[PDB]
C-alpha cells in the first residue's frame, strides 16, 4: 500500500503517515549547523549580491560568482567527503528560501547546476562517477547543466532526437544533436545529456530506440554553445543552445542503465521539484514585507491604506498563499528525508501551487504599490518578470496538472478494472481526522474530510464512465487536478497549524486563523468544482463549445469576428 | 429617470434604451471616411513604426513621431475647422484599436496628449480657448499633458496640494506645486493643471479652498520637468515629474468655472475612459492571432497542440474576453455619440474589464507559447510588461470597483431613504428580455434577467442593513462591483450577438456561441457570488479574519510566521 496522501485521496482514503504530525526531521547537530550557515548566506545576499545589477548586466557579477563558490553554494547537497556541504533536503530548502527571497536569477543558475544539472550523478552515479566528478562540481570549478529540451521536444521528452550510437568496440558512444534553452549551457563543463540509443532486449536481442542519460565533459570535444538568449526575466541566468557534433562519450559515462534515461530524467526533475516551492516561499516572504511596508506608510483618503478593506483582503490572501507554499515545500522535503518513495504527486502540486502563488502575490504587491509598483527602482517589477518562467519550466503547469490527475487516477483505475476480471465458473465513509488534527481545528478538519469524499466520488464516477479514455478528457483532468491541489493544500496547513497549536508555538493562534480562512474557501472551491463535474447539466455544453470556438479560431488564424462596424 | 442600464440594474430594473438594439451610429459618409483612414493608419503601424525599437530606445523613434504628426494622429477628435480630423467617439475607437494592436507605448503618448491632455479644452473650452489652442494641439506642434497626480495624491484627487493664488488685480493666478508621473511631462508645451484655489461663495462671500483647472503654457515661465522615469513597460511613453514655480497663469486660462476643477478632472477621465477598452480590444486581437499561430503549428505528443483540450479552452476563453471587451468599448462610444449623459458606471466597467482581460489574455498567450513566450524576440513579453499599468492608471481598478458599487447603490439608496421620510399626521418581477434578445438567445436572455434579480435583491438588502455606512463595507463593495461587471458583460454580448443574428451577419452563429458560453459561466458567478453575500454564514468569518490577519502583518512588518524550522 502507498504511504502517499495524494495517492490515497483519489481512492477516498485518508493515508496520513506522510502528513500528520507535521514532520520534524533534523537532529540537534543538523539544526545548529544549519543556523551557522543561514547567517553567512543571508549576509552574502544582503551585502555582496546586487540583484538589480545582475539583471541589468544579464549575468552574475564576477565578485558575486566567485563569492558563491567560496561560500560552498555550488555543492550544498554533495556529501562532505566529496567536497560538499553535506546538507539534507530540509536543510537545503532553508538555504534555497534565502536565495529565492533575494535573487531568482542567481537561484536558477545555482539550481540548474545542482538541483538538476548534476543531480543525476548524486542519484544514479556509480562510486567511480561520484568520486571523479562531484568534488569539482561542489566547488564550482566545473559548472553543470541539464540537457533535455530540443527545438522539437519540450513537454514530450520521449520525442527527443539527439542520438548516441555505440562503437563496435563498445568503448564509447558517438553523440550528435542540439539542445535548446539550456540553463548554464554557455557556462557548463559538465552536462547531463539525454539521447536516443539502440538498446538490445536481454531475452530476444531485438533492438529498440530508447533514451539513455550520459555525463558529458565539454573537454570530450565537439561541444559548442550559442550566445546567451535574451529573455523577460531571470536575466542573470545564462540560457543557451548547446550543440553536440560527433562527441565521443566513454561507455562508462552512461548514467544509470542504458535505455533507462527517460526514468533518470523524470527522477531528477521530481527530486529537484520541492526546491522551487522552497525558493518561491522565500520570494513571497520578501514581497509581502514590501507590500506591508507600503500599506503601513502610504496615506490616502485621510488614512494609512492598511485601514481599508480592499488592502486588508489583498494582504491576507498573500500571506495565506505564502504559508501554504512554504508548508508544502517543507512537507515534501521532510518526506524525502524520511525515505518516502511515493511523493511525485505532492511535489508536482507544490510546484504548480508555489509558482502560481508567487505570481499572484507579486502581481498584487504591484497593485498595492500603485504607480510606484510599475517603476523600475522599487524592484518589484523585476521579481514579477523573473517569476513568469516558473509556471513553464521544470514541467509546464498544464502538463503537471494532467500528470497529477492521471497519476492519482491510476491506482483507483486499477482497482476498478480488477472488479470484472475473473472468469465465471458455471459448474459450482467513517473517515475522520479526529486525533490527528488539533481540537481547535476540528471544524476545518471536517471540511477537509467532506471535500475528500466529494473528490473521490467524482474520480470513481469518471473512471467508470471513461475508463482508459479518461486520458483524453483534458477539460475534466484539469478540473480534477485543481481539486487535488486544494485538498493537499488543506491538509498541509491543517497539519502544520495543528503541530503549532499542540506545541504552543507563539504564532499558533495566527496559524489557526490562516488555516481556517484557507480551508473555508478551499472547501467551497472543491464543493462547487466537484458539483460542476458531476451534476451540472451545462458542463458538457461548455466543453463542446470550447472545442468548437477553438476550431473556428484555428480555421481563421485568429479572432473570427470583426469589430462591430464590420471593417 | 436615468437611461443607464447600469443604474437600472442596481434597482432591479431593465432599462434597455442604451443597450438594445446594439447601437449603430455612423452615417454612410462617416463610414466611408473611416475606411479611408483605417488603411493608411494600419500601413503606418505595419511599415513605419517599430514597437520593439521604441521599447529599446525608451522613446518613440523620430521618424515615427514626425510621421504620426503628418498622419493627423495628434488631433483625431478635434473638429476639422480647428485643424483636426473631426472624428466622433466611435470612429476614434476604431483607430485606437489599431494603435492598441500594434504599440501601447505610442498609444499612451497619443492618448495622454488627446484623450486626457487637452480633452478638457474640447469639453469645457470657451470659443476663444478652443481657437487659440486646438490647431497646434491637433498638428502635434504643441504636445499636451494632464497634470493631476502628486507625490501625496493619486487616487484621492481631492487631496492635491498644488496651489493657485489670485492676483489682487484679478488678471492672473500664481501657480506653485509639483506633479508626479505625468505622461508627456517632458514633451508637453500645454498642460491641463489642477490646483487648489480660494473660491468665494456667491451668497455669503465665505472663502473655501477648492480645485480649479487651468490651461498652462510652458512659455508662461517657471515650468520645468524631471528626467524620464524608468519603468517596466510602455517604455516609449515619456513619464516625468513636472514642477511649477511661481507660474503666472492668466485668469482667462481657467478651464470651466473657478472651483469646479474636480468635476472637470472627473469628466475628462470619464470621457476618455472608453478609449482604453478600445485599445485593449485591439491588443487582444493581435495577441490571439499570435497564440493561434503557435497552437496551429506546434507539434507536441504527436499532434498539433490545438488538438488538446487544455489549449482549446485557453483559446476559447481568450476570444470571449476579447469579444466582451470590444463589445463594451463600442457600446460606450456609441452611447456617448448618441448623447448619453449617464455612462460613467459603464465606462468604469469597461476599463476594469478590458484591462484585466488583456492582462489575462496575454499571460495565457505566453503559457501557450511555452518557453518561447518568455523570450524577448517574439515580443509577447513586451506587451505583457506594457499591460500591467492599465490596471492602475486612469483610476486604479480597486477604486473603480468601489466607484461602480457605490455609484450604482446611490439611486437605490435614495429611493429606500424616501420611504420613512414623511411626518405622520395623527389627526386625520415580470422582467423579460423577450422581444429584445433574438429568439435563438432566449435562454441566455433569461439567465441575464435571473442574475439581475439576484443582484438587485442583495443590493437592496445590504442598503437596508448598512445604510450610509455601506461606504465602509469594502469587502462587500468589491463583490457587488464584480457582479455588476459580469451583468453588464452579459447584456452587451447578448445585444451584439442578437443584432448579428437578426441581420444575418456571417459570424452570427459563432457570436451566438460566444454569448451562450460567456453567459453560462457569468450567470454562475453571479449566482454563487450573490449567495455568498446574502446567505452564507461563513462570509462574515472570512471578513473578520481578513482584517485580523492584515492587522497582524502590519504589526510585524511582514509575514508573522517563521518557516517550519523556526529560524
Ligand atoms: C529560461 C529557460 C530555461 C530553461 N532551462 C532548461 C534547462 O536548463 N534544461 C532543459 O532541458 N530545458 C530547459 N528549459 C526548457 C523548458 O523546460 C521548456 O520550455 C518547457 O519544458 C516547455 O517546453 P516547450 O517550450 O517546448 O513547450 P511545449 O511542450 O511545446 O508546450 C507548449 C504549450 O502546449 C502545452 N502542451 C504541450 N503538450 C500538451 C498536451 N499533450 N496537452 C495539453 N497541453 C499541452 C504546454 O503546457 C504549453 O502550454 C528552459 C526554458 C527556458 C525558457
Ligand atoms: C507610467 C504612469 C503614467 C501616468 N500618467 C499620468 C498622467 O499623465 N497624469 C496624471 O495625473 N497621473 C498619471 N499617472 C498616475 C496614476 O494615475 C496614479 O499612479 C494612480 O492614480 C494611482 O495613484 P497612486 O500611485 O498614488 O496610488 P494610491 O492612490 O496611493 O493607491 C495605492 C493603492 O491603494 C489603493 N487605495 C487607495 N485608496 C483606497 C481606498 N480608499 N480604499 C481602498 N483601496 C485604496 C489603490 O487602489 C492602490 O491599490 C501615471 C502613473 C504612471 C505609473
Curated annotation (Swiss-Prot), chains A, B:
Cofactor section: FAD
Post-translational modification: S-nitrosylation at Cys-169 in liver improves catalytic efficiency.
GO cellular component entries: mitochondrial inner membrane; mitochondrial matrix; mitochondrial membrane; mitochondrial nucleoid; mitochondrion; nucleolus; nucleoplasm
Region annotation (Catalytic) ranges: 4-414
Phosphoserine modifications at: 429, 434
Recorded consequence of changing residue 373 to D: In ACADVLD; likely pathogenic
Protein name, UniProt field: Very long-chain specific acyl-CoA dehydrogenase, mitochondrial
Gene that this sequence comes from: ACADVL
